[PDB]
Design a protein around this ligand. Structure first.
Ligand code: K
Ligand code: K
Ligand code: K
Ligand code: K
Ligand code: K
Ligand code: K
Ligand code: K
Ligand code: MG
Ligand code: MG
Ligand code: MG
Ligand code: MG
Ligand code: MG
Ligand code: MG
Ligand code: MG
Ligand code: MG
Ligand code: MG
Ligand code: MG
Ligand code: MG
Ligand code: MG
Ligand code: MG
Ligand code: MG
Ligand code: MG
Ligand code: MG
Ligand code: MG
Ligand code: MG
Ligand code: MG
Ligand code: MG
Ligand code: MG
Ligand code: MG
Ligand code: MG
Ligand code: MG
Ligand code: MG
Ligand code: MG
Ligand code: MG
Ligand code: MG
Ligand code: MG
Ligand code: MG
Ligand code: MG
Ligand code: MG
Ligand code: MG
Ligand code: MG
Ligand code: MG
Ligand code: MG
Ligand code: NA
Lengths: 50, 150, 104, 128, 114
RNA sequence: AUAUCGGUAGGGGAGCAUUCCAGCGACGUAGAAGGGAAAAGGGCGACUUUUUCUGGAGUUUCUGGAAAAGCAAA
RNA sequence: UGACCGAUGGAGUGAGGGCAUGGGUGCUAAGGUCCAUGUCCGAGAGGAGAAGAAUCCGGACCACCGGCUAAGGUCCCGAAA
RNA sequence: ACCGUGAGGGAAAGGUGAAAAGAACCUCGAACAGAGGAGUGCAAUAGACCCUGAACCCGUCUGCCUACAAGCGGUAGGAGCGCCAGGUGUGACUGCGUGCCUUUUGCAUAAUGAACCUACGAGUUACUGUUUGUGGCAAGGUUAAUUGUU
């Protein structure tokens, strides 16, 4: 190979997850969060030990 | 592009086979005769029947006043209508229609067995009802038909 | 002279030199001779024969002109309102065009 | 060279069209369109009389535009138009740019006022 | 770097607006109205592709009924006789013969009218 | 070969387009990008090709890399 | 059948509802309310019932102008005596 | 700029052409108000708001349809007419069809939301853990700050 035909090993790289970008992706709308409650809001975190 | 190459052909204004027929109402029941008349007008007896074309027959009914209504229907069937004003419901009977004229009763019965659209509104004009056996429809040569055969 | 015969599970009325489109026939070439011997009716300009167990000896020989004709695209759409579910695919049916040489 | 060739073709086409234009007239296009629809298709001298005696304000400007279009026909044909020979073959009114102003309303509110403009185009041709 | 897909974003709308041609009023050219109309039509088309087979079979049956009643039999009796005699001509072919080849239809009827 | 293939919340898999970069190939005043019209194509689709009018100076393929990486409603 | 069980990565849900059966409560009232056993809607399109979330039949990979049936039907609107 | 007594708040707005060669002169008109010519220029549909010139929105012409007709405006059939050789515009007449989003046990709902178009608009990055795909070494594995030569 050279600089014009570079190739990583099979399965070495993988595309990241992108949410909130439409219905076809399966990750739009509520964007994997469910509907309501505390865990659906921006800035929710888990109180560890609670 | 067309990959069918074997279609069913619809009749049109230039390909229909319209005929004038004469039927008699000497002792027939009103509804039972009018169902067959509706089939004749619609064109259910023609092998090239097409539901979007006026492809039926022009029907002349003679001896309309000899039609028979069984039971107490001549005065016990209450037709209701409304004038559009408050307290404006009215009643009338097949006897009232017959007194007005047999063509009115026959038209009322057949419109009701015909389809409820523009085509049916056009079809109802192909029916001709006469009280006696004398009518004037020369130049078209109508064909007598035995309604009991249908 | 016309016969009623079925080709790929569909009955067609065929005469001599007609250029039919039928459902795709696999592993054929241009000019290949195909044979169909399941005639149901034969009408020879006045004389009509109808076969229950088909018409014995009847036969239709055709030649393949195009081995793969694709039909017009159809949009396939599924949607359930207020649920977010939605998908839109495309479909093209596959045909082969034949020309009928001899009608026995 | 492409734009030069296209421009030459357009210039050659323009030599057989007899038209005049009025641009940026400060006046409602919907009101001018009434007069345009009134005079569309008329013989030119009759149209000139109609515009002279019409009860709409825009007819005064349309009359000058029609006179200019007749003069352009005469210049491009190198003669004079005989009586009853020309007619209004095409006329349109288009909306132009709008001036925006503000008018005070009660209780401190303010509303926008639109002062509209229009373009008019007139063609003339012989009654063929 | 900054990425904005202006041309692709506009081309996606223009392609669908090419398909909404012929509609009434705002439904032909106003994007959020035209797109809404287009998808409902696609659901209609899916349903109508299924209902077309039912409609054409009903038309064939009515034409066959008319021709058989000309020949002196009803549709149900004719179909019973056809299935008893075991001939496999389908309703589309029978209706086409009834409308266009009455002699062939008469032959079919006479074969099974025994 | 047989079986299977309705789906909300949600889990998993495989891809398209966009902007810039490296390497390798190309195109352009004998007409680039953009704009209008038409035609064709894709297991399927996101989309991609071709012709023509306008336009009058830049654009693009393949492999890999990185993100201000996609709107119909707040 | 095949997905039962272990260990690990990622969750969502924790407002349910109708019908049938066994009950409590109510007035042997409620499209009422509280449990249990099934089922369906929820998340399920198609057919009949005129038109109905869950009653009757039936689980939609795509195409077809082919054929057989289910519930329910076969005088006309409306397919078939 | 504008707004506020004041502290203070706080916009919008780039592009003719290589070169102004930025249109002498003629015609209509009271007037360049504007236009039609002539001329300059590769180009003026580059003419001063001037490169390109999209949508919503507004017109004219041509083709077909439309004054007995009734519901999300489409979809599947289907005559006739009209254009450029199997394509294309329109569409008499027929069947089926209560938008979409969100929220809900359940919405045509008389529950929420949007005048329309163009443009703008919402899971990102850093560090530390943990699991996994792929790799390098392997009873070992790996350097941090920093230092030399370039
Ligand atoms: K009922
Ligand atoms: K029937
Ligand atoms: K320019
Ligand atoms: K330039
Ligand atoms: K423009
Ligand atoms: K319609
Ligand atoms: K309210
Ligand atoms: Mg989901
Ligand atoms: Mg949404
Ligand atoms: Mg929400
Ligand atoms: Mg909740
Ligand atoms: Mg939650
Ligand atoms: Mg906050
Ligand atoms: Mg003014
Ligand atoms: Mg005046
Ligand atoms: Mg005041
Ligand atoms: Mg909108
Ligand atoms: Mg299934
Ligand atoms: Mg699925
Ligand atoms: Mg060019
Ligand atoms: Mg670029
Ligand atoms: Mg790449
Ligand atoms: Mg973005
Ligand atoms: Mg946008
Ligand atoms: Mg709780
Ligand atoms: Mg609870
Ligand atoms: Mg309850
Ligand atoms: Mg109860
Ligand atoms: Mg829910
Ligand atoms: Mg279920
Ligand atoms: Mg149902
Ligand atoms: Mg059967
Ligand atoms: Mg002045
Ligand atoms: Mg130009
Ligand atoms: Mg410009
Ligand atoms: Mg009337
Ligand atoms: Mg009329
Ligand atoms: Mg509620
Ligand atoms: Mg509902
Ligand atoms: Mg609310
Ligand atoms: Mg509102
Ligand atoms: Mg609403
Ligand atoms: Mg908006
Ligand atoms: Na995935």
């Amino acid at each position: 190979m050279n600089l014009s035909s570079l190739k990583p090993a099979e399965g070495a790289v993988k595309s990241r997850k992108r949410i909130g970008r439409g219905p076809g992706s399966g990750l739009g709308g509520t964007s994997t969060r469910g509907h309501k409650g505390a865990k659906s809001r921006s800035g929710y975190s888990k109180k560890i030990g609670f | 592009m067309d990959t069918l190459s074997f279609k069913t052909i619809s009749a049109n204004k230039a390909t229909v086979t319209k005929e004038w027929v004469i039927v008699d109402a000497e002792g027939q029941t009103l509804g039972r005769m009018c169902a067959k008349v509706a089939k004749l007008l619609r064109g259910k007896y023609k092998p090239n029947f097409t539901p979007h074309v006026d492809c039926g027959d022009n029907v002349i009914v003679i001896n309309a006043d000899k039609i028979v209504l069984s039971g107490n229907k001549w005065d016990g069937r209450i037709y209701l209508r409304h004038t559009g004003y408050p307290g404006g419901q009215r009643q009338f009977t097949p006897r009232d229609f017959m007194n007005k004229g047999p063509e009115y009763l026959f038209r009322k019965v057949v419109k009701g067995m015909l389809p409820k659209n523009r085509l049916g509104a056009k079809i109802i004009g192909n029916l001709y009802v006469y009280a006696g056996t004398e009518h004037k429809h020369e130049a078209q040569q109508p064909r007598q038909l035995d309604i009991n055969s249908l | 002279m016309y016969v009623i015969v079925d080709i790929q599970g569909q009955q067609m009325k065929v005469e001599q030199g007609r250029r039919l489109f039928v459902h795709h026939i696999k592993d054929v070439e241009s000019g290949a001779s195909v044979e169909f011997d399941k005639v149901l009716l034969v009408d020879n300009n006045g004389a009509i024969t109808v076969g229950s167990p088909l018409v014995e000896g009847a036969k239709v020989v055709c030649e393949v002109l195009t081995p793969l004709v694709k039909g017009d695209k159809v949009l396939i759409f599924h949607k359930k309102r207020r649920k977010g579910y939605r998908k839109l695919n495309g479909h093209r049916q596959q045909f082969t065009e034949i020309l009928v040489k001899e009608v026995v | 060279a492409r734009k030069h060739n296209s421009a030459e073709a357009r210039k050659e086409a323009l030599k057989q069209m007899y038209f005049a234009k009025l641009r940026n007239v400060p006046t409602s296009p919907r009101k001018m369109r009434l007069v345009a629809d009134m005079i569309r298709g008329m013989e030119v001298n009759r149209a000139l009389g109609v515009l002279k005696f019409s009860n709409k304000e825009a007819s005064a400007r349309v009359e000058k535009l029609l006179r200019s279009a007749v003069a352009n026909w005469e210049e491009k044909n190198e003669r004079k138009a005989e009586e009853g020979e020309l007619f209004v073959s095409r006329i349109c009114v288009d909306g132009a740019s709008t001036l925006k102003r503000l008018r005070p309303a009660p209780q401190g509110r303010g509303y926008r006022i639109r002062k509209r403009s229009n373009h008019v185009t007139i063609y003339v041709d012989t009654l063929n | 770097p900054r990425s904005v897909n202006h041309v692709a974003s506009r081309a996606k709308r223009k392609r669908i607006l090419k398909l909404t041609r012929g509609y009434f009023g705002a439904r032909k050219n106003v994007w959020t109205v035209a797109k809404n109309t287009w998808e409902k039509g696609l659901t209609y088309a899916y349903r109508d592709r299924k209902s077309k087979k039912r409609n054409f079979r009903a038309l064939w049956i009515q034409r066959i009924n008319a021709a058989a009643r000309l020949e002196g039999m009803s549709y149900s009796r004719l179909m019973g006789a056809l299935h008893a005699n075991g001939i496999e001509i389908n309703r589309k072919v029978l209706a086409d013969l009834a409308m266009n080849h009455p002699e062939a239809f008469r032959a079919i009827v006479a074969k099974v009218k025994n």
